[PDB]
Amino acid sequence: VFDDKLLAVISGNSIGVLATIKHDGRPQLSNVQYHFDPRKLLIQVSIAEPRAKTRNLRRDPRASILVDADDGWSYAVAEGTAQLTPPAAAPDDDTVEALIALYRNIAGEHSDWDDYRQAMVTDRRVLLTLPISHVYGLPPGMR
């Protein structure tokens, strides 16, 4: 039941710190917006192919994400192995579809889906699906 406390932190937020592994083995850090699927215990995020974090995950898919509790001090960290889609290549391909689904979960119903599809392709957007294999941290009550 202790993991339920760590999952709750992840569920109560939409932004976290994604840590990837550089070519030299050193950690690389950045923040990302995300959607947490409690059903499959997945964390879904959108990223760009040319970005460092993306090139890192292509060589080494291991990833972790730290998320702060609402007190801004307590936290939970999800660790797992990323599953990336190829980059959007056409406004109607499967990657763009999964990204349309994510956007709905993050921001809601987009206004100009056609413009969105165009943008996903222009930015070579990739959907990062990170199944949670292990969670650690210091959830509220422990800090």
Ligand X SMILES: Cc1cc2nc3c(=O)[nH]c(=O)nc-3n(C[C@H](O)[C@H](O)[C@H](O)COP(=O)(O)O)c2cc1C
76 marked ligand binding residue: no
Distance between CA atoms of 3 and 124, rounded to whole angstroms?
A: 35
Q: Roughly what angle, to the nearest 10 degrees, separates helices 113-122 and 94-106?
A: 120
Q: What's the distance, Cα to Cα, between the start and end of the chain in Å?
A: 18
Distance between CA atoms of 44 and 38, rounded to whole angstroms?
A: 11
Measured CA to CA in angstroms, residue 36 lies from 8, 85, 87 at distances of 10, 18, 21
Q: Which does 17 bind (CB under 5 to 8 A by kind): ligand X, a copy of itself, none?
A: a copy of itself
Measured from the CB atom, is 26 or 39 closer to a copy of itself? Answer: 26
Measured from the CB atom, is 39 or 108 closer to a copy of itself? Answer: 108
Stretch 23-52 residues interacting with ligand X (CB under 6 A) = 30-33, 45-47, 51-52
128 neighbors 44 (Cβ within 8 angstroms): yes
Residues near a copy of itself (CB under 8 A): 15, 17, 19-21, 25-31, 60, 62-64, 66, 68, 73-75, 77, 79, 137-138
Identity at 132, one-letter amino acid code: I
Q: Which does 47 bind (CB under 5 to 8 A by kind): ligand X, a copy of itself, none?
A: ligand X
- Please report, in range form, the residues annotated as the binding site for coenzyme F420-(gamma-Glu)n: 28, 33, 46, 52-56, 73-75, 134
- Please report, in range form, the residues annotated as the binding site: 28, 33, 46, 52-56, 73-75, 134
Residues that bind ligand X (CB under 6 A): 30-33, 45-47, 51-53, 73, 138
